[PDB]
Design a protein around this ligand. Sequence first.
Ligand SMILES: CCCCCCCCCC(=O)CC(=O)N[C@H]1CCOC1=O
Ligand SMILES: CCCCCCCCCC(=O)CC(=O)N[C@H]1CCOC1=O
Ligand code: NA
Lengths: 223, 233
Amino acid sequence: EGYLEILSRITTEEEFFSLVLEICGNYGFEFFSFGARAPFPLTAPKYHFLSNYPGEWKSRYISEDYTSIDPIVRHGLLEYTPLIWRFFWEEALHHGIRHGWSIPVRGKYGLISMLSLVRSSSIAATEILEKESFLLWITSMLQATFGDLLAPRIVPESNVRLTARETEMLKWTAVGKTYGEIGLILSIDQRTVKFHIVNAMRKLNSSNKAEATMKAYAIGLLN
Amino acid sequence: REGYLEILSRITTEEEFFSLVLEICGNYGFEFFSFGARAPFPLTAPKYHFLSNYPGEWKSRYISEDYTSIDPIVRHGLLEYTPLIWNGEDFQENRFFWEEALHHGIRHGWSIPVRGKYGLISMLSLVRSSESIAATEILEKESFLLWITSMLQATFGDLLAPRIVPESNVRLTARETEMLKWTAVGKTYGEIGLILSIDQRTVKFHIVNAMRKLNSSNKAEATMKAYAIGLLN
Ligand SMILES: CCCCCCCCCC(=O)CC(=O)N[C@H]1CCOC1=O
Ligand SMILES: CCCCCCCCCC(=O)CC(=O)N[C@H]1CCOC1=O
Ligand code: NA
């Protein structure tokens, strides 16, 4: 092999863009789509994805906000297994996107990501059961680097540090404890509980303790 | 693969699960193994479920001292998300931890963390006493191990979610699911009814039901429990 060596060197979007464009081809593919859904906000999480799909297709996919209906994408949220694969489908087919393999991997900071390698001429148990275990391997290492790149812009809270105390205040808040209940549990004063929470809210750029707690959890800060 | 898939669709018991891992451990050139999963509830202190064939005196200390919450390999698995080759001799901190493991032959390890359904986080470790895991042996078994760990995990997960993740059987309707999304972010019942153009009393109706299904005494608990299980998003 020789990819961890390329990655440990890669430090930009294009370097990632072209490092996948080569893997795309070196395994018989023309289209590639690496996507990543942030955990925030909960009510409309924001995806981020580079590709090489037809320009006309990129723009229209956004236009109608297809992320909220795309089955290739819904899978990447409920299932942890790879997937060899409505006027929506019709609108796509006629662009060169009908034959492709999507690989969903969970990553740091609660990021849910997917490598969807598509081609313009399908399934092959002798090609799948042949590259199956690699494709998956590549994907995990792709997402690792990809997150280390996106986390900055995409999950700005990723470099948040949480004091021991704040971590413990957030955990008891995750379970719905009032400032008063936490004190009796921790044998500590009330203004004390509020103090630490209020600090974490700020670092975590949240309007309130529930949003904070949720953001902290969603990122692994309470793990 | 030689029908691991078949051997794995059969597995219905823990001891069955135990022997598959043990054969893999042996077949793949190691000596000890562990496999465990971390359930997400309660969020205050998640519980771990694991087995190994480590020397009995280490099993006992590992459980006694609650090492799941100290073991750096476990921290890596939760916090980063990738496979890791390690050598107990190398670590500079946690010597009280590492010396004792070195003492029992737990020196060269290969660990593969993975995420699965219901907020279950799992990890296979293959370990041996001598002969370090080198670039070549990895070049060879790496992909297979990463795959078999995905497999092993879905099993361990379907095999145990029941007692491990009690609220994992829960189903939420579109409305309950949206009330929780807005609750996670701290909206009140009044704000949610305005936001969705439905009566406050109905917002309440659905959250109360969502609370009862997820066995929570408060909407905040319910929301977070729902989140961890993948019910939201
Ligand atoms: C892991 C959950 C999704 C993370 C974000 C992915 C966004 C990428 C959107 C996308 O292009 C989906 C995709 O690859 N499907 C193709 C196939 C047919 O029509 C498409 O747009
Ligand atoms: C992140 C998911 C973790 C799943 C829980 C698995 C618990 C089993 C922990 C374990 O025994 C790992 C391990 O082998 N640690 C080694 C390292 C040195 O001493 C050990 O016991
Ligand atoms: Na982007």
